[PDB]
Short mmCIF file of C-alpha atoms in Angstrom, two decimals:
data_model
loop_
_atom_site.label_atom_id
_atom_site.label_comp_id
_atom_site.label_asym_id
_atom_site.label_seq_id
_atom_site.Cartn_x
_atom_site.Cartn_y
_atom_site.Cartn_z
CA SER I 65 135.04 62.28 119.46
CA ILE I 66 137.78 59.65 119.48
CA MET I 67 137.66 56.31 117.65
CA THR I 68 139.15 53.22 119.29
CA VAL I 69 139.14 49.75 117.75
CA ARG I 70 139.74 46.59 119.75
CA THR I 71 140.42 42.97 118.83
CA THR I 72 140.11 39.99 121.15
CA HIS I 73 142.18 37.64 118.99
CA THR I 74 145.52 38.27 117.32
CA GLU I 75 145.12 35.12 115.24
CA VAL I 76 142.25 32.79 114.31
CA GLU I 77 142.76 29.39 112.65
CA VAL I 78 140.38 27.57 110.31
CA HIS I 79 140.45 24.47 108.11
CA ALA I 80 140.17 25.07 104.37
CA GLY I 81 136.56 24.87 103.26
CA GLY I 82 135.35 25.92 106.70
CA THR I 83 134.01 29.22 108.04
CA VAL I 84 135.88 31.62 110.32
CA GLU I 85 135.14 34.72 112.38
CA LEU I 86 137.62 37.53 113.03
CA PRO I 87 136.49 39.49 116.13
CA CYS I 88 136.33 43.28 116.19
CA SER I 89 134.74 45.90 118.43
CA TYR I 90 134.99 49.68 118.58
CA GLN I 91 134.19 52.70 120.71
CA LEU I 92 133.23 56.15 119.43
CA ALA I 93 131.90 58.93 121.65
CA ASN I 94 130.32 62.32 121.05
CA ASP I 95 129.13 61.23 117.61
CA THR I 96 125.78 59.76 116.57
CA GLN I 97 126.52 59.56 112.84
CA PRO I 98 127.07 55.97 111.55
CA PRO I 99 130.77 55.22 111.08
CA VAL I 100 132.04 53.23 108.09
CA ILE I 101 133.28 49.72 108.85
CA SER I 102 136.01 48.47 106.51
CA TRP I 103 137.69 45.06 106.49
CA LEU I 104 140.89 45.20 104.42
CA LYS I 105 143.46 42.50 103.60
CA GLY I 106 147.13 43.43 103.51
CA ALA I 107 150.24 44.64 105.33
CA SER I 108 148.51 47.84 106.43
CA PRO I 109 145.13 49.55 106.02
CA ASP I 110 146.52 51.84 103.30
CA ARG I 111 148.15 48.98 101.37
CA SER I 112 145.37 46.41 101.16
CA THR I 113 142.51 45.08 99.06
CA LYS I 114 138.87 45.46 100.11
CA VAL I 115 137.13 42.58 101.80
CA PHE I 116 134.01 44.24 103.19
CA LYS I 117 132.58 47.72 103.79
CA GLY I 118 129.42 48.77 105.57
CA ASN I 119 127.58 51.38 107.62
CA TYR I 120 124.26 51.90 109.34
CA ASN I 121 122.00 54.61 108.06
CA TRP I 122 121.18 57.55 110.27
CA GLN I 123 117.62 57.09 111.53
CA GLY I 124 117.11 60.33 113.40
CA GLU I 125 117.60 62.12 116.69
CA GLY I 126 117.16 59.59 119.47
CA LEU I 127 116.49 56.86 116.92
CA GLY I 128 119.02 54.07 117.20
CA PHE I 129 120.53 52.33 114.17
CA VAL I 130 118.72 49.36 112.60
CA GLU I 131 120.70 46.50 111.05
CA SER I 132 118.07 46.26 108.32
CA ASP I 133 118.64 49.85 107.16
CA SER I 134 122.32 49.67 106.30
CA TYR I 135 124.86 49.40 103.50
CA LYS I 136 126.91 46.18 103.46
CA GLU I 137 129.08 44.93 100.61
CA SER I 138 131.73 42.26 100.06
CA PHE I 139 134.37 42.67 97.33
CA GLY I 140 136.49 40.83 94.79
CA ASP I 141 137.66 37.35 95.74
CA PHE I 142 135.56 37.68 98.93
CA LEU I 143 132.31 38.64 97.24
CA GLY I 144 129.54 36.40 98.51
CA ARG I 145 131.69 34.91 101.29
CA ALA I 146 132.39 37.89 103.56
CA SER I 147 129.82 39.47 105.86
CA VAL I 148 129.36 41.41 109.10
CA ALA I 149 126.17 40.54 110.99
CA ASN I 150 126.35 43.44 113.47
CA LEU I 151 127.96 46.68 112.28
CA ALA I 152 128.03 47.96 115.89
CA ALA I 153 130.35 45.03 116.82
CA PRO I 154 131.79 44.43 113.28
CA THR I 155 133.22 40.93 113.69
CA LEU I 156 133.84 39.49 110.21
CA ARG I 157 132.58 36.11 109.01
CA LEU I 158 134.30 34.51 106.01
CA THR I 159 132.79 31.33 104.60
CA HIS I 160 134.20 28.57 102.39
CA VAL I 161 137.75 29.54 103.33
CA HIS I 162 140.42 28.93 100.70
CA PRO I 163 144.21 28.72 101.24
CA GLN I 164 144.59 32.11 99.55
CA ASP I 165 142.38 33.63 102.26
CA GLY I 166 145.24 33.20 104.70
CA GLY I 167 146.85 36.51 105.58
CA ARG I 168 146.43 39.72 107.54
CA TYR I 169 143.01 41.35 107.89
CA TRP I 170 142.31 44.86 109.12
CA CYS I 171 139.20 45.95 110.98
CA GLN I 172 139.00 49.67 110.31
CA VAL I 173 136.23 51.89 111.63
CA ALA I 174 136.08 55.54 110.62
CA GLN I 175 133.67 58.38 111.33
CA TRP I 176 131.32 59.26 108.50
CA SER I 177 132.91 62.01 106.37
CA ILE I 178 136.06 61.42 108.43
CA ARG I 179 138.13 64.59 108.63
CA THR I 180 140.39 63.97 111.61
CA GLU I 181 142.90 61.29 112.55
CA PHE I 182 140.94 61.14 115.80
CA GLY I 183 137.96 59.57 114.04
CA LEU I 184 139.66 56.46 112.63
CA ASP I 185 141.31 53.42 114.18
CA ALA I 186 142.25 49.98 112.91
CA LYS I 187 143.78 46.76 114.17
CA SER I 188 144.71 43.54 112.39
CA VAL I 189 143.87 39.88 112.88
CA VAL I 190 145.76 37.05 111.20
CA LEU I 191 143.63 34.46 109.43
CA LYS I 192 145.49 31.15 109.54
CA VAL I 193 144.33 28.40 107.22
CA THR I 194 145.32 25.11 108.83
CA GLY I 195 148.27 23.62 106.97
CA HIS I 196 148.92 26.60 104.69
CA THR I 197 149.47 29.79 106.68
CA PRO I 198 152.67 30.25 108.76
CA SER I 199 152.15 30.97 112.45
CA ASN I 200 153.91 33.24 114.95
CA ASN I 201 153.57 36.39 112.84
CA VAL I 202 154.42 39.83 114.23
CA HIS I 203 151.79 41.41 116.47
CA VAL I 204 151.75 44.98 117.84
CA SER I 205 149.44 46.25 120.60
CA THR I 206 149.92 49.83 121.83
CA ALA I 207 148.18 51.88 124.51
CA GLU I 208 144.90 53.38 123.33
CA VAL I 209 145.48 56.81 124.85
CA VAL I 210 148.37 58.56 126.62
CA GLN I 211 148.94 62.15 127.70
CA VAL I 212 151.85 64.49 128.36
CA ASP I 213 151.77 68.02 129.75
CA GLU I 214 153.00 70.74 127.41
CA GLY I 215 156.75 71.22 127.77
CA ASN I 216 157.31 67.72 129.14
CA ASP I 217 158.69 64.59 127.48
CA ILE I 218 156.97 61.26 127.02
CA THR I 219 158.08 57.79 126.00
CA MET I 220 155.57 56.03 123.79
CA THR I 221 155.94 52.25 123.89
CA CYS I 222 155.33 49.61 121.22
CA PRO I 223 154.60 46.29 123.01
CA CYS I 224 154.85 43.31 120.66
CA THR I 225 155.24 39.58 120.02
CA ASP I 226 157.36 37.74 117.45
CA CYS I 227 159.05 41.07 116.74
CA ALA I 228 162.75 40.20 116.98
CA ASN I 229 164.96 42.38 114.78
CA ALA I 230 161.97 44.14 113.22
CA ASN I 231 162.29 47.41 111.33
CA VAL I 232 160.43 50.08 113.31
CA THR I 233 158.43 52.94 111.81
CA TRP I 234 156.20 55.40 113.64
CA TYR I 235 153.53 57.38 111.79
CA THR I 236 151.04 60.13 112.56
CA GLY I 237 147.48 60.34 111.25
CA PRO I 238 146.24 59.10 108.92
CA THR I 239 145.03 62.34 107.29
CA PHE I 240 142.40 62.66 104.57
CA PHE I 241 143.28 65.38 102.06
CA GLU I 242 144.27 62.90 99.35
CA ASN I 243 142.45 59.70 100.34
CA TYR I 244 139.07 59.48 102.06
CA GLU I 245 138.74 55.70 102.46
CA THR I 246 141.87 54.91 104.50
CA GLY I 247 143.64 58.24 104.49
CA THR I 248 147.41 58.58 104.20
CA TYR I 249 149.90 57.76 106.95
CA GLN I 250 152.71 60.28 107.46
CA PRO I 251 156.11 58.87 108.55
CA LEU I 252 157.21 60.18 111.95
CA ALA I 253 160.31 58.19 112.90
CA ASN I 254 162.23 55.14 111.69
CA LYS I 255 164.91 52.80 113.00
CA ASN I 256 166.25 49.98 110.83
CA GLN I 257 168.19 46.89 111.92
CA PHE I 258 171.40 48.75 111.15
CA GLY I 259 170.96 51.25 113.96
CA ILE I 260 170.30 54.12 111.59
CA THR I 261 167.46 56.49 112.55
CA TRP I 262 165.28 59.10 110.82
CA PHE I 263 162.85 61.67 112.22
CA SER I 264 160.26 63.93 110.57
CA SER I 265 160.87 67.69 110.48
CA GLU I 266 158.09 68.04 113.06
CA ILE I 267 160.12 66.32 115.79
CA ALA I 268 163.72 66.24 114.54
CA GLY I 269 165.87 67.66 117.32
CA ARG I 270 163.66 66.67 120.24
CA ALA I 271 163.09 62.96 119.72
CA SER I 272 164.93 59.65 119.89
CA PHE I 273 164.40 55.92 120.22
CA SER I 274 164.64 54.32 123.65
CA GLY I 275 165.66 50.74 123.12
CA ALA I 276 164.60 48.88 119.99
CA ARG I 277 161.14 50.40 119.50
CA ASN I 278 160.03 53.09 121.93
CA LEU I 279 159.85 56.64 120.60
CA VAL I 280 160.77 59.42 123.00
CA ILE I 281 159.38 62.87 122.27
CA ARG I 282 160.80 65.83 124.17
CA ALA I 283 159.23 69.21 124.97
CA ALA I 284 155.70 68.28 123.90
CA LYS I 285 153.88 70.87 121.80
CA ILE I 286 150.11 71.31 121.60
CA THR I 287 150.51 70.60 117.88
CA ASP I 288 151.91 67.19 118.87
CA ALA I 289 148.43 66.04 119.89
CA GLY I 290 146.89 63.50 117.55
CA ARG I 291 147.12 59.82 116.70
CA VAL I 292 150.46 58.06 116.34
CA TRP I 293 151.17 54.57 115.07
CA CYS I 294 153.91 52.07 115.75
CA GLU I 295 154.58 49.68 112.90
CA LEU I 296 156.97 46.75 113.07
CA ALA I 297 157.99 44.97 109.87
CA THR I 298 160.13 41.85 109.44
CA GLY I 299 159.63 41.56 105.69
CA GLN I 300 157.66 42.61 102.63
CA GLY I 301 154.82 40.12 103.09
CA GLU I 302 151.50 41.12 104.65
CA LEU I 303 151.99 38.71 107.56
CA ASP I 304 155.40 40.31 108.13
CA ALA I 305 154.05 43.64 109.33
CA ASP I 306 151.66 45.02 111.91
CA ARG I 307 150.79 48.36 113.47
CA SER I 308 148.66 49.77 116.27
CA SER I 309 147.69 53.32 117.20
CA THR I 310 147.75 55.53 120.27
CA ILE I 311 146.08 58.90 120.82
CA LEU I 312 148.58 61.44 122.14
CA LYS I 313 146.88 64.04 124.35
CA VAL I 314 148.48 67.51 124.42
#
């Protein structure tokens, strides 16, 4: 059962006072338990504030989910203004938009009682409030799934836009032994704008960067399988960072 989240728009603009919709869709196979939909605002899923959370309620074998039997809640500054009309295609609607609503929003969908990095995915969408939010913010969009035969090497790419001179950090996971909501992302590799690189003990000695972003892993191990993330950051602000995941098969 692998979770994959997709977004049709990288950025959506809206005049202050108006209403906006941030598209989101997901795919989850081999699992009939209702996943938890989470919309989070921030630089990354693990460093954000809650906007909305929801999930269908298991009906029964063969019984599909019913929008009416579900948990849906908006939080904090978004309470009463944020909603998701269809949890199966969790696009977010935010009404009465304020300048402060501008920023980076994450659509995260995770299996119920998530216990594997394979059951969670997330992608971000920039909410631009006409006349207040800067445009042309970093955007990352990686392959959903790639595979490499044991013993072989693979080059994982990190396609992007408005990513010139960005710091690059790859992660694995997230894992859920300390945090169940978003999990914790484990650093895998890093390359700063000074040409200095770092690699986790799991791959140090058989990995390197190819170009400015791509991570090359040599002599693939079965324990290498899992989800990896490529994050590009051009600053400390939430609009200054983005990340996307890829499932690495064997």
